[PDB]
Amino acid sequence: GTREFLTFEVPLNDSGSAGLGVSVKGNRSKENHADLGIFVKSIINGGAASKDGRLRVNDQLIAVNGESLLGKANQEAMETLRRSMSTEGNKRGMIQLIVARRIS
């Protein structure tokens, strides 16, 4: 019982150029070699994510702008959020986010 979902709305009115203000990186199963999703590698202390006050490194992504990523590779997912954050989420000024983090 050390897992909790986190849905956040990240405004990038200014970060629109930086995408949002975070570095993403996903893993891959050891044997299955299947993408294990993306994880916040490093949040730009200043971007939209860091300003949101709800984004923290080591947070696994599940859905961005109402678009799940579990149905795609890490690179595809990070790219899916990239476009979703700089094309659909920015359109209004903020992108919807859904990440899962373990209690630690």
Binding site: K25, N27, H33, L81
Partner: peptide
């Protein structure tokens, strides 16, 4: 448990 071939993407 990565394959030592990960990568980061600035978003």
């Amino acid at each position: 448990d990565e394959d030592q071939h990960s990568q980061i993407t600035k978003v």
